[PDB]
């Protein structure tokens, strides 16, 4: 997980974490999804770009960004603080 390893082990990325906030993920699945998205963001460096969508019968962004941002310490902090507020309710629609 170290910066030097994750740097020398691949090329810069354009990640788009697509959380599922349907009703069925409510309970323990939602908690594990929050912790997982955070621990996944912690594997991004400053050359990689990231954004966290979220879909439940409607696909919306999870934060104030609406496009791929640079994944530095401040942007990752924004994304984590916005993911920790996710709630689960609705139907699922993978096409949206």
């Amino acid at each position: 997980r170290r910066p030097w390893y994750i740097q020398g082990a691949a090329s810069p990325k354009d990640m788009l974490i697509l959380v599922d906030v349907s009703g069925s993920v409510s309970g323990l699945t939602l908690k594990l999804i929050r912790t997982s998205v955070s621990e996944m963001l912690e594997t991004l460096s400053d050359d990689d770009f990231v954004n966290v969508a979220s879909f439940n019968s409607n696909a919306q962004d999870v934060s104030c960004f609406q496009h791929l941002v640079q994944a530095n310490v401040r942007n990752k902090k924004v994304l984590k603080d916005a993911v920790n507020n996710i709630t689960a309710k609705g139907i699922t629609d993978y096409k949206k």
Binding site: G23, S24, S26, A88, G90, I91
Partner: protein
């Protein structure tokens, strides 16, 4: 009280009808055993295919 102008159906009630109803109430009980309840208003395909098929059971009874 009422005369025999309404009884267009009294003849059919004494047919082997209770079998058609005892095997219609069984499919309606099985259509409640396969219903899978999901948390917080979620739903899947089959649960939507059983809410329509409930009008077919609400009309026979």
């Amino acid at each position: 009280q009422n005369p025999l102008r309404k009884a267009c159906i009294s003849i059919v009630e004494w047919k082997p009808f209770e079998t058609i109803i005892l095997l219609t109430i069984f499919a309606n009980c099985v259509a409640l055993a396969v219903y899978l309840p999901m948390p917080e208003d979620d739903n899947n395909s089959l649960n939507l295919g059983l809410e329509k098929l409930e009008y077919f059971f609400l009309t026979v009874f």
